Write a protein that binds this ligand. Structure first.
Ligand SMILES: *[C@@H](C)[C@H]1/C(=C/c2[nH]c(/C=C3N=C(/C=C4\NC(=O)C(CC)=C4C)C(C)=C\3CCC(=O)O)c(CCC(=O)O)c2C)NC(=O)[C@@H]1C
Ligand SMILES: O=S(=O)(O)C[C@@H](O)CNC1CCCCC1
Ligand code: NA
Ligand code: NA
Ligand code: NA
Ligand code: NA
Length: 159
């Protein structure tokens, strides 16, 4: 499953040639965290930045039990500076040098399980429909892989 994440994250990064790809997973209370990353050589890994560069707290998704994702909606942002985010949100994005990004839902069964994010640093992006569609397909495949990893867990407890 780590294998799966690594595999998925590297694929998205190479297919989109973006700076960073992240996998987010929700906890039962809709808190969550980034559990996997694929990142280009030029940037420091997320966990390392988190040990040194503090952020504004962000409980939005938790307070809203998944927000737009829960309704199968995605976020596609060509330019974060132009998007109209709250100041704290934009400040967080800017802390990670994120200038354009995509975030899509990952569903495991009919349950919102997490998110798949793709980030471009330093310059805006004109995202294309096929890039978004491809990310959704990869997110669906990830969801299936997780769903079946679960199924196989349930199987091996039951013997
Ligand atoms: C300012 C911070 C207010 C706020 C705004 C806000 N945030 C989101 C959505 C997201 N915020 C995050 C951020 C994190 N996830 C993490 O694991 C970490 C630690 C490194 C951070 C900083 C993420 C992943 C999301 C989902 C993707 C996105 O960037 O939008 C929203 C929803 C925006 C929308 O329209 O969908 C909003 C409004 N959060 C707060 O708590 C402050 C009041
Ligand atoms: O739209 S929702 O009700 O999910 C939540 C609300 O926080 C919207 N975020 C704005 C949307 C437009 C881009 C800037 C950020
Ligand atoms: Na949040
Ligand atoms: Na969002
Ligand atoms: Na915002
Ligand atoms: Na299945």
């Amino acid at each position: 499953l780590q294998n799966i994440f690594r595999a998925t994250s590297d694929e998205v990064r190479h297919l989109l040639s973006c700076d960073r790809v992240l996998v987010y997973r929700f906890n039962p209370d809709w808190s969550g965290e980034f559990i996997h990353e694929s990142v280009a050589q030029m940037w420091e890994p997320l966990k390392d930045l988190q040990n040194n560069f503090p952020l504004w707290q962000d409980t939005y998704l938790q307070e809203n039990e998944g927000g737009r994702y829960r309704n199968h909606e995605s976020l596609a942002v060509g330019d974060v500076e132009t998007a109209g985010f709250t100041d704290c949100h934009l400040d967080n994005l800017r802390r990670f040098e994120i200038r354009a990004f995509l975030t899509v839902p990952v569903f495991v069964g009919e349950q919102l399980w997490g998110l798949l994010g793709a980030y471009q640093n330093g310059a805006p992006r004109h995202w294309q429909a096929r890039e978004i569609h491809l990310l959704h397909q990869i997110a669906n495949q990830l969801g299936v892989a997780v769903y079946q990893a679960q199924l196989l867990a349930r199987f091996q407890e039951l013997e």
